[PDB]
């Protein structure tokens, strides 16, 4: 999280002989932006560490940045990074809250196939977007994602099985992330934010090996 | 700066090399190598620490409640409770 | 080093003798306590450290990994308190053959 | 190679599948790809490559510690 | 083309353009929402074919031309081409029917399986479609969020065309990691308590 | 889910136990 | 392949006139540690995503372009557990039945 | 997962 006026600091590296690394900006909807490197530009600041530093106050950040490693001189296939996402925010300073939606029985009931929908809680200002998580394990099959009052668009959904979304397992952690004071709230960094998403029969059976206790005390 | 300790029951000490040296609660209880960057339980209410660098790193303190669910007194989980129970200690 | 006090439930976070506690949590009404302790009421499994009085927060050493429930009028659970569990059973099978 | 991907188990090929004795599954729409819910399937890149798989993590199974072995070995002999 | 929308199984022609040819890299992209961009191809060679997949190439007409056989779900994404930075040289985006059932849910009402063709407190979701692999069976869908004015499905969609026969409920209707192994294990402690 | 018939099948079991 | 756990066993077909090597999930294998080693029929290893992959025997020289038999062997195998594998519950049961019997 | 317990005491409850 980048409160306006601090300094982030996003780190990439390789491990596997790319003499050329770049970062990438991709603005949500209609942009897309290269900044500059040095292996051996506005608004932002060894061949295996490859660090991106902030240093300024620009607001029109509003981005993804990616990060980019390939060969020179072979066919050039291209390496990119999973992605980053930035904050600017000028008390007032809030980051905006995702909330989780779980499918009803009527959709699998009627067609037999689940779909989850996860919501981040908008506001006037911008700068939140990307995608999202699961289950501790990023699955990379079947992701789909993405006015107000005058005091930026972002919702996932996913396509599941009736057989694989039943389960609290599977465990969709939804969360767009701002990555990374004299209000009573918690500093801004905090931490990830995320909204989470059967187990409590497991938790049950954990529960009355209570009764498999009983039974050895007993004997 | 350090803050190497991070928390699929999964014990990390990132940026470290050869010998890693697991201590629960101070004491010497486990040995990692190179090629693993993992340690697993197997609640883990435990005090832990690793040491690749000089006296081990900054300590973490975890400890797990079971249920996701169980916020208050829900029905679906009274019922399940109540049933369990009674019949559990009729017998 | 944080233990818990069983009332709400309370977390409490000893610390050095300093002149000042402060708190980084990870308008709510339900993130309210005194002294040295810190409880959460209606506790959410969303983004919902603690050091004396200094200048960052790296001298509080220790952190602390929490995935539990906050609650009033609600019995503890723990590894332990499965045996708190067993108690509940016999006593109310205690309760019922009287 | 072969794949793991949501509710049921996959084997998959660049050309047709052909199924030695092992655990029958179902073919999938994609005539190159099976399904599965052990068998040895012949792939080409040509040159040929044959695979034999068997996996270990259970949508059904058991698995337990040694003092759970003794507490297992326990109940059913008191069971008897 | 532009977000076309094509039936399953059909022919694609994706075009790109360029305007260099002090270049060597031609390669082609899927982009996922949260998975950055993953490489597809190798014509950096006119015709190279891996299983769906083939393209053309002509330096001297300055476009570069993709074909897909039988393009699946798997095609709706952004398909991209590629100081030896990735100018993606035109771009293309497409979505794919998979035509073979139209139903609203409410959950944040969820429209979907229409198959075709389809003021402040209501907020909605546009159209789409994707790869769905275990079952290889494919659904459309779009979701209405509210809050406010206590919204229902069927006023929600009213500029949505709700297809003729939308199915509208509105009022009505793998283990792992050891311990479910072991309920399935410990049923001997569980039941011998009998007698007991 | 195939633990309500767990269930239902627990029933089953403890209505075969009182028949014995 | 037949495939105990007592530290795992590894079976891999006799070859005649043929030296006996490992590989595992592209990477080399010892046979380094204890639970590493191997010198004359089988490979004994296992942890979980760390040791879940490949497990195949190579000769000396021709390797490994010459050999198209690849196992992909992929496992959780906790520390000290029990052979199980998927259907054998029965067996499982097979097992406790004897007990019973004796 | 529930074969387990259909498996015999079904077949043997219901008649
Ligand atoms: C890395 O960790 C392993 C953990 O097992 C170390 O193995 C054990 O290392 C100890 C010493 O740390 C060995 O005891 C004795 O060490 C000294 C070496 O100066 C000497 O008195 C003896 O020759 C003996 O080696 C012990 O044998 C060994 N035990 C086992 C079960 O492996 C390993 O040495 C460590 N590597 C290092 C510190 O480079
Ligand atoms: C061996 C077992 C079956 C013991 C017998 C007790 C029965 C009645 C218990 C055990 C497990 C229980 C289930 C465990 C988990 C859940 C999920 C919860 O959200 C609703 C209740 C529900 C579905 C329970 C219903 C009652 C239940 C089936
Ligand atoms: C799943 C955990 C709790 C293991 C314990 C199994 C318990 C719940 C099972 C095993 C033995 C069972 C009992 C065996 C005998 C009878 C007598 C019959 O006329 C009514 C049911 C009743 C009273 C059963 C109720 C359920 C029971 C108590
Ligand atoms: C290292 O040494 C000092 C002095 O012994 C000790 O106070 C400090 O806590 C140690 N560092 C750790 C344990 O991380």
């Known amino acids: 999280v980048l409160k306006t006026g601090q300094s982030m600091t996003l780190q990439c590296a390789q491990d596997?002989?790319?003499?050329?690394m770049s970062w990438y900006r991709q603005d949500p909807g209609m942009g897309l932006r290269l900044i500059h490197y040095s292996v051996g530009p506005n608004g932002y600041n060894t061949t295996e560490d490859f660090p991106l530093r902030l240093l300024s106050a620009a607001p029109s950040q509003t981005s993804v940045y990616f990060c980019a490693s390939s060969y020179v001189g072979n066919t050039g296939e291209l390496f990119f990074g999973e992605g980053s996402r930035l904050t600017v925010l000028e008390k007032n300073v809030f980051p905006p809250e995702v909330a989780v939606f779980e499918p009803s029985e009527a959709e699998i009931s009627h067609t037999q196939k689940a779909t989850l929908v996860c919501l981040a809680t908008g506001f006037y200002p911008d700068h939140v977007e990307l995608s999202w998580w699961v289950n501790g394990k990023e699955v990379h099959s079947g992701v789909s994602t993405d006015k107000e009052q005058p005091a930026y668009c972002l919702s996932s959904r996913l396509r599941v099985s009736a057989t694989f979304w039943q389960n609290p397992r599977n465990h969709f952690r939804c969360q767009v992330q701002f990555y990374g004071w004299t209000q009573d709230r918690a500093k801004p960094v905090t931490q990830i934010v995320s909204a989470e998403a059967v187990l409590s029969a497991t938790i049950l059976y954990e529960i009355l090996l209570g009764k498999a206790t009983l039974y050895a005390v007993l004997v | 700066g350090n803050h190497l300790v991070k928390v699929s029951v999964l014990l990390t000490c990132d940026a470290e090399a050869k010998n890693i040296t697991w201590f629960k609660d101070g004491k010497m209880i486990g040995f990692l190598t190179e090629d693993k960057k993992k340690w697993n339980l197997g609640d883990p209410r435990g005090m832990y620490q690793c040491k690749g660098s000089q006296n081990k790193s900054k300590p973490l303190q975890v400890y797990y409640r079971m249920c996701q669910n169980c916020i208050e007194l829900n029905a679906a989980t009274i019922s399940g409770f109540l049933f369990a129970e009674i019949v559990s200690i009729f017998v | 080093p944080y233990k818990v006090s069983i009332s709400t439930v309370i977390l409490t976070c000893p610390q050095y003798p300093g002149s000042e506690i402060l708190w980084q949590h990870n308008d709510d009404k339900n993130i309210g306590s005194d002294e040295d302790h810190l409880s959460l009421k209606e506790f959410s499994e969303l983004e919902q450290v603690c050091y004396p009085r200094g200048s960052k927060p790296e001298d509080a050493n220790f952190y602390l990994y929490l995935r539990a429930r906050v609650c009033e009028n609600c019995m503890e659970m723990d590894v332990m308190s499965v045996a708190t569990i067993v108690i509940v059973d016999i006593c109310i099978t205690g309760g019922l053959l009287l | 190679p072969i794949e793991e991907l949501e509710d049921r188990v996959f084997v998959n090929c660049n050309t047709s599948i052909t199924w030695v004795e092992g655990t029958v599954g179902t073919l999938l729409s994609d005539i190159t790809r099976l399904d599965l819910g052990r068998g040895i399937y012949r792939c080409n890149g040509d040159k040929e490559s044959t695979v034999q798989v068997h996996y270990r993590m259970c949508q059904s199974c058991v698995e337990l510690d040694p003092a759970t072995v003794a507490g297992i070995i326990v109940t059913d002999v008191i069971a008897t | 083309p532009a977000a076309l929308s094509v039936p399953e199984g059909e022919n694609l022609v994706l075009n790109c353009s360029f305007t260099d040819s002090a270049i060597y890299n031609l390669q082609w992209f899927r982009q996922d929402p949260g998975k950055g961009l993953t490489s597809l191809l190798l014509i950096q060679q006119r015709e190279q074919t891996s299983g769906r997949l083939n393209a053309s190439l002509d330096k001297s007409s300055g476009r570069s031309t993709l074909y897909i056989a039988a393009s699946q779900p798997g095609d709706s994404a952004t398909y991209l081409c590629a100081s030896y930075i990735p100018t993606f040289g035109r771009g293309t985006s497409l979505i794919v029917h998979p035509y073979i059932d139209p139903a609203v849910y409410q959950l944040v009402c969820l429209f979907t399986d229409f198959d075709s063709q389809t003021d402040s407190d209501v907020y909605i979701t546009d159209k789409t479609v994707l790869d769905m692999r275990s079952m290889d069976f494919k659904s459309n869908s779009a979701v209405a969020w509210s809050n406010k004015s206590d919204f229902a499905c069927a006023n929600a969609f009213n500029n949505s065309i709700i297809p003729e026969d939308t199915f509208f409920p509105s009022p009505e209707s793998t283990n792992l990691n050891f311990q479910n192994l072991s309920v399935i294990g410990f049923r001997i402690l569980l039941l011998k308590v009998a007698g007991f | 889910l195939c633990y309500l018939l767990d269930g239902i099948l627990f029933i089953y079991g403890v209505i075969l136990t009182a028949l014995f | 392949y037949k495939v105990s756990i007592s530290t795992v066993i590894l079976t891999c077909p006799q070859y005649p006139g043929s030296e006996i090597l490992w590989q595992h999930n592209d990477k080399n294998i010892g046979g380094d540690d204890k639970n590493i080693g191997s010198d004359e029929d089988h490979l004994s290893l296992f942890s979980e995503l760390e040791q879940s992959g490949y497990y195949v025997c190579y000769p000396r020289g021709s390797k490994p372009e010459d050999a198209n038999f690849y196992l992909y062997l992929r496992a959780r195998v906790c520390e000290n557990c029990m052979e199980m594998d998927v259907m054998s519950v029965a067996t499982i049961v097979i097992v406790d039945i004897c007990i019973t019997g004796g | 997962l529930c074969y387990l317990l259909d498996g015999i005491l079904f077949i043997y409850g219901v008649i």
């Open positions: 596997m002989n790319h003499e050329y």
